[PDB]
Amino acid sequence: SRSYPCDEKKQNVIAECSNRRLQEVPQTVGKYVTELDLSDNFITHITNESFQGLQNLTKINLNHNPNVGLNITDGAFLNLKNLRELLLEDNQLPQIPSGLPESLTELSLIQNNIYNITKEGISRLINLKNLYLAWNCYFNKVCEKTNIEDGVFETLTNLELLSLSFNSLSHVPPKLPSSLRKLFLSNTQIKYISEEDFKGLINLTLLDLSGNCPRCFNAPFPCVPCDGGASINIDRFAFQNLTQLRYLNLSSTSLRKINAAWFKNMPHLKVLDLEFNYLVGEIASGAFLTMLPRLEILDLSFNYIKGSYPQHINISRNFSKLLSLRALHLRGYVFQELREDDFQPLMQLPNLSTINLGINFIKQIDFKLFQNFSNLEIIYLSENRISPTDFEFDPHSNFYHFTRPLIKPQCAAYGKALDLSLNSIFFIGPNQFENLPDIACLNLSANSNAQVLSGTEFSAIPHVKYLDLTNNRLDFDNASALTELSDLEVLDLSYNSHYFRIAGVTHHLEFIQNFTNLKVLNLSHNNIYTLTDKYNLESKSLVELVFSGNRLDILWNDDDNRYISIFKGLKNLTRLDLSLNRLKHIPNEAFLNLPASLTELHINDNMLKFFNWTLLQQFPRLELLDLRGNKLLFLTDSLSDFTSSLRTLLLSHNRISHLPSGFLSEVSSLKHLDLSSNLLKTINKSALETKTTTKLSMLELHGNPFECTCDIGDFRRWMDEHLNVKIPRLVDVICASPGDQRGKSIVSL
Amino acid sequence: RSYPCDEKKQVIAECSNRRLQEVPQTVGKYVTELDLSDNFITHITNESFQGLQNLTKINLNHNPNVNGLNITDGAFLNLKNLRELLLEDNQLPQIPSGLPESLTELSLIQNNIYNITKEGISRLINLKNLYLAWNCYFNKVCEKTNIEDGVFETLTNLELLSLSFNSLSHVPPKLPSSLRKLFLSNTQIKYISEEDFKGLINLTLLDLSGNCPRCFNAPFPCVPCDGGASINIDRFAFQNLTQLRYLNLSSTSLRKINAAWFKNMPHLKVLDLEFNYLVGEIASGAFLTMLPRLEILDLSFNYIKGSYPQHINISRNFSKLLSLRALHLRGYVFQELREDDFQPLMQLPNLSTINLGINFIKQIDFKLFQNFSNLEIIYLSENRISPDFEFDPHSNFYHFTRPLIKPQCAAYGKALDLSLNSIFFIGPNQFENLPDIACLNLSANSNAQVLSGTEFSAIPHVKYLDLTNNRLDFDNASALTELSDLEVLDLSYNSHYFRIAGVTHHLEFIQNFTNLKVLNLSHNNIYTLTDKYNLESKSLVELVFSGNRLDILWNDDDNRYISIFKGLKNLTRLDLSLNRLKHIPNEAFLNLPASLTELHINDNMLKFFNWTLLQQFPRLELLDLRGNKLLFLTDSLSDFTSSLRTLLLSHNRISHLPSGFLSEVSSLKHLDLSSNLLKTINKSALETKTTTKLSMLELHGNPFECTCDIGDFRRWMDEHLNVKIPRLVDVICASPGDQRGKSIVSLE
Numbered sequence A: 001s002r003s004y005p006c007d008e009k010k011q012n013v014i015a016e017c018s019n020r021r022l023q024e025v026p027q028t029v030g031k032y033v034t035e036l037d038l039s040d041n042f043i044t045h046i047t048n049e050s051f052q053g054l055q056n057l058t059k060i061n062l063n064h065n066p067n068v069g070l071n072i073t074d075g076a077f078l079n080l081k082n083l084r085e086l087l088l089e090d091n092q093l094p095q096i097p098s099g100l101p102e103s104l105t106e107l108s109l110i111q112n113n114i115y116n117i118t119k120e121g122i123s124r125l126i127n128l129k130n131l132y133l134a135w136n137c138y139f140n141k142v143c144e145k146t147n148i149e150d151g152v153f154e155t156l157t158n159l160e161l162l163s164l165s166f167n168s169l170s171h172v173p174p175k176l177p178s179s180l181r182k183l184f185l186s187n188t189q190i191k192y193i194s195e196e197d198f199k200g201l202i203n204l205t206l207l208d209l210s211g212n213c214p215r216c217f218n219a220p221f222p223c224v225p226c227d228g229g230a231s232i233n234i235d236r237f238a239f240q241n242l243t244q245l246r247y248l249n250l251s252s253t254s255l256r257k258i259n260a261a262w263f264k265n266m267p268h269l270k271v272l273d274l275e276f277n278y279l280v281g282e283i284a285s286g287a288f289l290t291m292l293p294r295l296e297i298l299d300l301s302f303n304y305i306k307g308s309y310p311q312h313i314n315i316s317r318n319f320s321k322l323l324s325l326r327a328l329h330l331r332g333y334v335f336q337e338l339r340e341d342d343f344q345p346l347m348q349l350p351n352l353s354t355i356n357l358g359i360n361f362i363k364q365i366d367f368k369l370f371q372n373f374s375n376l377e378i379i380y381l382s383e384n385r386i387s388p389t390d391f392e393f394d395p396h397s398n399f400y401h402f403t404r405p406l407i408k409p410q411c412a413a414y415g416k417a418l419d420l421s422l423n424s425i426f427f428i429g430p431n432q433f434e435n436l437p438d439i440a441c442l443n444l445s446a447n448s449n450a451q452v453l454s455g456t457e458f459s460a461i462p463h464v465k466y467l468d469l470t471n472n473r474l475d476f477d478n479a480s481a482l483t484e485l486s487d488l489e490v491l492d493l494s495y496n497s498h499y500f501r502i503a504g505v506t507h508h509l510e511f512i513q514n515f516t517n518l519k520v521l522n523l524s525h526n527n528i529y530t531l532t533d534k535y536n537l538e539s540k541s542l543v544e545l546v547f548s549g550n551r552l553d554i555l556w557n558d559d560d561n562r563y564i565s566i567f568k569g570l571k572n573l574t575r576l577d578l579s580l581n582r583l584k585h586i587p588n589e590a591f592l593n594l595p596a597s598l599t600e601l602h603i604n605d606n607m608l609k610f611f612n613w614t615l616l617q618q619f620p621r622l623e624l625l626d627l628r629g630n631k632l633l634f635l636t637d638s639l640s641d642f643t644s645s646l647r648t649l650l651l652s653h654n655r656i657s658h659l660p661s662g663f664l665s666e667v668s669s670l671k672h673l674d675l676s677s678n679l680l681k682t683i684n685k686s687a688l689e690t691k692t693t694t695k696l697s698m699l700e701l702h703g704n705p706f707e708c709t710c711d712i713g714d715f716r717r718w719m720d721e722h723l724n725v726k727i728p729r730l731v732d733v734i735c736a737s738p739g740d741q742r743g744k745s746i747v748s749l
Numbered sequence B: 001r002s003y004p005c006d007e008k009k010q011v012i013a014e015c016s017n018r019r020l021q022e023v024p025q026t027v028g029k030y031v032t033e034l035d036l037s038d039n040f041i042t043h044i045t046n047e048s049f050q051g052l053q054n055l056t057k058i059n060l061n062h063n064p065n066v067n068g069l070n071i072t073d074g075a076f077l078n079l080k081n082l083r084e085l086l087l088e089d090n091q092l093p094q095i096p097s098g099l100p101e102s103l104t105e106l107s108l109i110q111n112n113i114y115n116i117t118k119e120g121i122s123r124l125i126n127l128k129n130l131y132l133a134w135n136c137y138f139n140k141v142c143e144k145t146n147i148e149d150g151v152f153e154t155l156t157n158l159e160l161l162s163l164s165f166n167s168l169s170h171v172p173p174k175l176p177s178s179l180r181k182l183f184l185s186n187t188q189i190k191y192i193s194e195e196d197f198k199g200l201i202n203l204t205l206l207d208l209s210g211n212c213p214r215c216f217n218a219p220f221p222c223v224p225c226d227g228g229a230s231i232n233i234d235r236f237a238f239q240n241l242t243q244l245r246y247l248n249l250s251s252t253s254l255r256k257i258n259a260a261w262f263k264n265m266p267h268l269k270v271l272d273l274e275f276n277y278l279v280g281e282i283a284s285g286a287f288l289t290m291l292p293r294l295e296i297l298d299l300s301f302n303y304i305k306g307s308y309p310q311h312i313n314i315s316r317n318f319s320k321l322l323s324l325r326a327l328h329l330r331g332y333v334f335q336e337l338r339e340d341d342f343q344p345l346m347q348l349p350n351l352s353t354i355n356l357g358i359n360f361i362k363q364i365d366f367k368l369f370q371n372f373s374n375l376e377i378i379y380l381s382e383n384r385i386s387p388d389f390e391f392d393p394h395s396n397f398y399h400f401t402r403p404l405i406k407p408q409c410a411a412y413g414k415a416l417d418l419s420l421n422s423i424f425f426i427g428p429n430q431f432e433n434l435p436d437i438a439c440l441n442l443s444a445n446s447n448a449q450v451l452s453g454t455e456f457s458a459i460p461h462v463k464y465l466d467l468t469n470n471r472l473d474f475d476n477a478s479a480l481t482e483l484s485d486l487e488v489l490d491l492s493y494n495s496h497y498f499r500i501a502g503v504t505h506h507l508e509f510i511q512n513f514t515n516l517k518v519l520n521l522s523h524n525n526i527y528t529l530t531d532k533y534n535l536e537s538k539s540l541v542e543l544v545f546s547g548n549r550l551d552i553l554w555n556d557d558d559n560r561y562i563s564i565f566k567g568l569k570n571l572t573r574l575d576l577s578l579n580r581l582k583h584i585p586n587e588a589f590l591n592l593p594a595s596l597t598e599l600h601i602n603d604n605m606l607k608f609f610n611w612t613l614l615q616q617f618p619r620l621e622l623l624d625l626r627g628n629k630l631l632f633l634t635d636s637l638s639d640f641t642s643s644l645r646t647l648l649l650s651h652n653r654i655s656h657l658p659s660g661f662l663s664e665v666s667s668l669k670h671l672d673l674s675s676n677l678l679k680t681i682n683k684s685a686l687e688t689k690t691t692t693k694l695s696m697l698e699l700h701g702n703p704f705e706c707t708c709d710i711g712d713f714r715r716w717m718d719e720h721l722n723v724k725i726p727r728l729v730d731v732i733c734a735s736p737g738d739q740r741g742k743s744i745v746s747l748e
């Protein structure tokens, strides 16, 4: 049938029931459901009856109930004989619930109020593979020191992952099972790591001891250093028997000195995180660098000496021993100048593909040094000074750094990438790119660049294919701009509105036609409303034009003809975005002059009161039409007369009060119709008049003010009979009248 | 209570933009000025104003609002005192027939009138001001304007005539000599003869701009004279224009200005010559000797296309402009300004404003601004220094008329605006040899430096400093402290480094200012500070903290910022709008300065507000909680404040009003409950023994139930007519249907 209140669907069966304002566990769930997600509802109480007839559930998620404490009686879950993954995060739980099923393999209890880790609660769960207990007591939270009953984990003999981070521990719990692979103990106020602490865990691949004896200067959180800001104290033989270790996080442990012999017996170490320490000394001289022959990722970010600004970065020769190194991060070291000889030790590494020098206030760089490298793919120099919920930190993300790729992947994919974003390159000199290697992806966003590009500024790197010049203040006064880059495929000129705003300066966009291979052009949020000389955009190649956040309302205004064909010369164009252009009306001749090659057309978030549906006869490839967030007052009754290509029609956030007789099913093409957040109070039988298939497989109707009287029943039978038409969010397809039905789903009466 | 207009005296009916479909027949019969603009009115007849004799002014602009306005012959003619009639933007195809002989002002701007006729105009002999601009222009489909010979001749009191933006081709003959102001911009007149203005001895303003326009880079469809020739003005065309004060010749494609045009023009004060081709004349400039009483000279946008000369070339004869107060040279385009290039201007005694905006200037020898007698405004924005219808028919077409520098900044003294330049850091000699500057603009220079307490030492008296839209790195606690006289500091939109956790942010310098009155930290995304977590000043009166992250600063797991504003002991005004606050901790709220009079927490997401806590705020006059998610008010609000005059609660989720709330506090003049969820206002809500001192209660936008029991509130309204409820048309019944859309003030 049609499931309510959850949306149920099957994979190699999952009832997503989240964020639905549910007051208690709905009882109408399907029977063959394996994975239920009740996250973000308003459930206050779980008992042994809440999931009575669903013994085929292997996964329940009750995270963030009740959002804006959750009461769970003992053994509530005890009957669920297949339950393996139980997620109870962010629930103000005061203790680990009693009587959890011996079946559990995964138990998350992140972001609760649990300070007593106890055998009664945990020792029964001998199938546990992952247990997450992070973030129950941290920062200035009002909470107790955490109590870990002795030997509480030693039963958990297939335990592979244990996370106790952001809890007050003081010391590494004794008696962990040697099954452990991943041990997270970040920000647990442990000052001292003894020889005994992990002697037994011979399978460990990840150890996280970060933020114990933190470096607190400029902490974005309440930060409590060890006494005299001292180093975490790691015993000489603490990592002796950790032969399988692959991931070592030692960020913010106030390290000044690394004991090289710590790495003696972990020659498979792949990822070493050493951010926010005091290692300027160790970076220039460290022995430990010789002990890391398989290391792929080394993170030394934010080791700057406070108030210190050395002229040069000082890199030990021993970096030349890091033969497997793939990515080196050296943000926040802070130094003025980068010279060829400062990086000799890295030049011979065969796999060094990422070098990250973000946020170092670098003033000058000798670009020729990147030339002398095996296979640099990513040169990240963003944010230097080159010149011509309810909690703040995601419990599931890295705490010390953003985890996203450095360069957008769609740019990096083209080849070698140079990111000079967020510098002070306000003008591109004639030699600013001399001695660079053959860059394919270049980022110059947010340099306050205010110049007049003219066909020569990129001569030294003519093979750029993806060029980001967003958030600058370019002065488009020359028609040869960027014409030197004849392989250019993607050009992003978003947020260069500064000069476009000014009537009196010129604005030349002619250079666009000069590329034989330009595919994607983003002119968004430029406030374009007047151009000089040539009023039209032209390209034989261009496939996608993004023109959001401009002033087509002025370009196409009734008293001016000059821009009536503005986009017509884009002969290859399939995708066009005209959103956010304050259009109240589009002149018919202007709509007719959009390229007939369009398959996708967005005019969302404007101000349209009317739309000439007849004009779609001229767009025989048009598959997606998006008119969301306008003021449209009705629809045409003749849609099938005007297109046989349209598959998706998005009409949400408009003012439609009536759906025409023979609308739904007369148009063969249409798969997906979105009428959410309109002014429909019913749907007439006659709009449901049916042909073939109807082909409609998705119809959105949430947010309309349906009159839930016996009038609607025609539509209800229709839904009942056309179960191939997915209606999402049934709990939001709600009745506005009369008062007895007000606020309920239309499906529930 | 008037309806549907809002009425008031000195008697004026403000009835605009109200969705009305006919002229209302329920307008007070005393009303003298009536404004019905922006309504949906389609028809006007001799009935529409039948009971409103005594009307002196009617505004019908822009009806119907989103065909046109149909007006019958004689519709208005029974209105015998009617002086001002405004009919702009109504798609009138003709001047309406049989208008009353009493009219002194008639405005027909923005219609489809291409025929000016005696039948329409010639008996309207009391006319002082006739506006017919913008009826045919650009690529509008419209006809060349036909002016019946002599049509203006009987208008012998006509002082102002505006025909701009119509296709005229020639100056109309037979203009009455009572004319003071004649507007003929963009009328396609290529030639001015000696006859055209021969009798106009009272003219103080002539506007001939946009005839033979300079079309290069035009922001509108532009049609040049052939060859781009200049307007052709006869040597004697201004013989008798002895009273002329304003002459506008912008965009007339002038290469050469004939000095003799000014032979008989001793009072010219304002001369506008933008968008011509006058680079040569600026250098040679015979005409200048003719204009020793001129006050304003606008020479902006005379740049030669694709010419970037090294220097500006200013004729020595500029020194004859002895009454010049303001010189505008935007858009000349030149590389460098040397002292010798402005010699001619250095002895002009009243030259207070020099405007060099948008010239792409790279180097300025700043010491040259000392040899000036009394420059008050040095405007150098937008250079290059280093270390319906598009146009408003009531505004200048060739430039914005706002002030160059903000008045609040210029009022302090000499002013220097280097906004939108490329001063990405202030070098150590960036300001030497400047005049004693009191108002300084450095907005939008992409400045990224660590200000450290010496960068402004050569202009140590600045009192208003604008550093907006930069990317400053707040890493030295002595930044700006060399400005001991500083009173206003704007640091808005410097979010760049503020949004990065790993860099330092030191705001300690705030404390060092003995005279700091206004501080703007808006839109900086402030969420973390280094070492010192508190703002402190003994002087500060106003702090703007909108668009930051108080949600993070005061989150529940961190206490370091719980007194962030307590040390602002003198503060009266505080804006916490736009900080994504879902809740304020009680301790953080009680730590706001006890001295506050005006507190804004609008446009957050506050679900709850602790009203109790207003006990700690005995000077609190204005509290703004608009644009939140508040579900309710307290029961006993007088228990908590005796000072509150204005409470703004619009756009919240309040559905029930507490007993006696409308008279509960009695310091309160303004209560705004618009756009909430009130269905009605119960009897218990109006119970008091105190007299209410409320004078404005706002309720539009609540979904009222218009059943018979809204009667009690209707009665209270009827009884409390001192309590203004504006916008009664929008105080609307949500129910029952068939009462839907109607103002609660109707029915049973």
Ligand SMILES: *[C@@H]1O[C@H](CO)[C@@H](O[C@@H]2O[C@H](CO)[C@@H](O[C@@H]3O[C@H](CO)[C@@H](O)[C@H](O[C@H]4O[C@H](CO)[C@@H](O)[C@H](O)[C@@H]4O)[C@@H]3O)[C@H](O)[C@H]2NC(C)=O)[C@H](O)[C@H]1NC(C)=O
Binding pocket: A165, A182, A186, A206, A208, A210, A247, A248, A249, A250, A271, A273, A394, A395, A396, A397, A398, A399, A400
């Ligand atoms: C110290 O360094 C260590 C070693 O790098 C670091 O360990 C990593 O922590 C992250 C953060 O939890 C782990 O990432 C998770 O891995 C699981 C398992 O596949 C994913 O499901 C998670 O993704 C979900 O959540 C994300 C964020 O909300 C979403 O982006 C996504 O939609 C998912 O729903 C998440 O990636 C990571 O696996 C470990 N690394 C290893 C190898 O185990 C540790 O965090 C550092 N310590 C601190 C305090 O930063």
Ligand SMILES: *[C@@H]1O[C@H](CO)[C@@H](O[C@@H]2O[C@H](CO)[C@@H](O[C@@H]3O[C@H](CO)[C@@H](O)[C@H](O[C@H]4O[C@H](CO)[C@@H](O)[C@H](O)[C@@H]4O)[C@@H]3O)[C@H](O)[C@H]2NC(C)=O)[C@H](O)[C@H]1NC(C)=O
Binding pocket: B181, B185, B205, B207, B209, B246, B247, B248, B270, B272, B392, B393, B394, B395, B396, B397, B398, B399
């Ligand atoms: C060529 O130069 C001349 C001389 O400078 C210039 O004449 C000026 O035109 C403007 C634009 O109309 C006039 O400004 C108006 O003056 C009246 C009367 O005092 C005001 O009502 C107007 O203000 C209303 O409208 C404004 C804009 O909507 C609103 O901001 C304001 O709040 C009011 O509602 C308006 O200021 C100006 O008076 C004349 N100057 C003189 C001395 O008479 C002419 O515009 C120039 N020509 C072109 C095409 O630019």
Ligand SMILES: *[C@@H]1O[C@H](CO)[C@@H](O[C@@H]2O[C@H](CO)[C@@H](O[C@@H]3O[C@H](CO)[C@@H](O)[C@H](O[C@H]4O[C@H](CO)[C@@H](O)[C@H](O)[C@@H]4O)[C@@H]3O)[C@H](O)[C@H]2NC(C)=O)[C@H](O)[C@H]1NC(C)=O
Binding pocket: B408, B409, B468, B488, B490, B492, B518, B519, B520, B522, B542, B544
């Ligand atoms: C940074 O914050 C500062 C300080 O708040 C801010 O400067 C202030 O801007 C306001 C404008 O919002 C100025 O107040 C105006 O002053 C004029 C001039 O006389 C008055 O006409 C105004 O009153 C009318 O308009 C108000 C609404 O704007 C109505 O409230 C009023 O009833 C009238 O209709 C108005 O009060 C104030 O003078 C300045 N202060 C200073 C010192 O300049 C600055 O704009 C902010 N910066 C940025 C970049 O946003």
Ligand SMILES: *[C@@H]1O[C@H](CO)[C@@H](O[C@@H]2O[C@H](CO)[C@@H](O[C@@H]3O[C@H](CO)[C@@H](O)[C@H](O)[C@@H]3O)[C@H](O)[C@H]2NC(C)=O)[C@H](O)[C@H]1NC(C)=O
Binding pocket: A410, A411, A470, A490, A492, A494, A520, A521, A522, A524, A544, A546
């Ligand atoms: C300027 O416009 C361009 C082109 O539209 C923007 O780049 C495009 O960004 C969209 C996301 O908005 C990308 O689509 C996404 O790609 C991923 C990766 O396969 C996919 O998982 C997502 O579901 C989605 O489809 C698209 O690839 C990307 N295109 C290019 C050529 O980069 C760009 O972001 C806009 N610039 C700015 C500043 O907004």
Ligand SMILES: *[C@@H]1O[C@H](CO)[C@@H](O[C@@H]2O[C@H](CO)[C@@H](O)[C@H](O)[C@H]2NC(C)=O)[C@H](O)[C@H]1NC(C)=O
Binding pocket: A382, A406, A407, A408, A411, A419, A421, A422, A443, A444, A445, A446, A468
């Ligand atoms: C060029 O650099 C800019 C600025 O660093 C990058 O912009 C960031 O993009 C990410 C990825 O989506 C956003 O989530 C960040 O918020 C952006 N930061 C800012 C300040 O805008 C940009 O993506 C880079 N361009 C490419 C092609 O890699």
Ligand SMILES: *[C@@H]1O[C@H](CO)[C@@H](O[C@@H]2O[C@H](CO)[C@@H](O)[C@H](O)[C@H]2NC(C)=O)[C@H](O)[C@H]1NC(C)=O
Binding pocket: B381, B404, B405, B406, B409, B417, B419, B420, B441, B442, B443, B444, B466
């Ligand atoms: C300093 O310079 C900036 C930029 O020229 C001025 O900002 C403009 O202010 C006006 C007038 O209020 C606004 O209408 C414009 O939109 C603003 N433009 C920009 C780019 O922000 C600023 O007001 C000047 N400051 C002072 C004190 O004069």
Ligand SMILES: CCCCCn1cc(-c2ccccc2)nc1N
Binding pocket: A304, A309, A332, A333, A334, A359, A360, A361, B450, B473, B474, B475, B502, B503, B504, B505
């Ligand atoms: C990695 C972050 C270092 C924070 C301290 N610091 C240092 C500077 C700075 C250093 C050198 C030049 C200019 C500025 N700015 C700041 N904010």
Ligand SMILES: CCCCCn1cc(-c2ccccc2)nc1N
Binding pocket: A452, A475, A476, A477, A504, A505, A506, A507, B301, B303, B308, B330, B331, B332, B333, B358, B359, B360
């Ligand atoms: C006043 C308007 C001039 C318009 C043409 N122009 C000229 C320049 C330019 C000139 C000289 C240096 C840098 C830029 N930029 C532009 N856009």
Ligand SMILES: *[C@@H]1O[C@H](CO)[C@@H](O)[C@H](O)[C@H]1NC(C)=O
Binding pocket: A323, A324, A325, A350, A351
């Ligand atoms: C370099 O990377 C290649 C390809 O992934 C891999 O085969 C090899 O192990 C790496 N070389 C070294 C010395 O680690």
Ligand SMILES: *[C@@H]1O[C@H](CO)[C@@H](O)[C@H](O)[C@H]1NC(C)=O
Binding pocket: A455, A480, A483, A513, A514
């Ligand atoms: C760009 O193309 C146009 C016409 O297609 C041509 O006029 C112009 O010379 C070209 N400019 C170059 C290649 O720099």
Ligand SMILES: *[C@@H]1O[C@H](CO)[C@@H](O)[C@H](O)[C@H]1NC(C)=O
Binding pocket: A516, A517, A540, A541, A542, A543, A572
């Ligand atoms: C049209 O677009 C496709 C890519 O979508 C491309 O292969 C082709 O070269 C384009 N046409 C021209 C003439 O460039």
Ligand SMILES: *[C@@H]1O[C@H](CO)[C@@H](O)[C@H](O)[C@H]1NC(C)=O
Binding pocket: A588, A589, A592, A612, A613, A614, A615
């Ligand atoms: C659609 O456009 C054409 C002009 O292209 C026009 O003739 C027709 O009247 C228009 N239809 C509507 C409803 O505007």
Ligand SMILES: *[C@@H]1O[C@H](CO)[C@@H](O)[C@H](O)[C@H]1NC(C)=O
Binding pocket: B349, B350
């Ligand atoms: C012009 O300046 C002179 C000399 O400084 C002064 O005497 C005179 O009063 C000023 N006149 C005006 C109108 O400002």
Ligand SMILES: *[C@@H]1O[C@H](CO)[C@@H](O)[C@H](O)[C@H]1NC(C)=O
Binding pocket: B514, B515, B517, B538, B539, B540, B541, B570
């Ligand atoms: C407190 O503010 C007022 C208002 O500006 C001012 O008069 C007084 O001097 C201020 N306190 C100082 C400057 O210490």
Ligand SMILES: *[C@@H]1O[C@H](CO)[C@@H](O)[C@H](O)[C@H]1NC(C)=O
Binding pocket: B586, B587, B610, B611, B612, B613
């Ligand atoms: C508001 O403030 C008082 C004093 O801090 C507090 O104790 C009271 O519980 C709060 N009110 C609400 C509704 O939480």
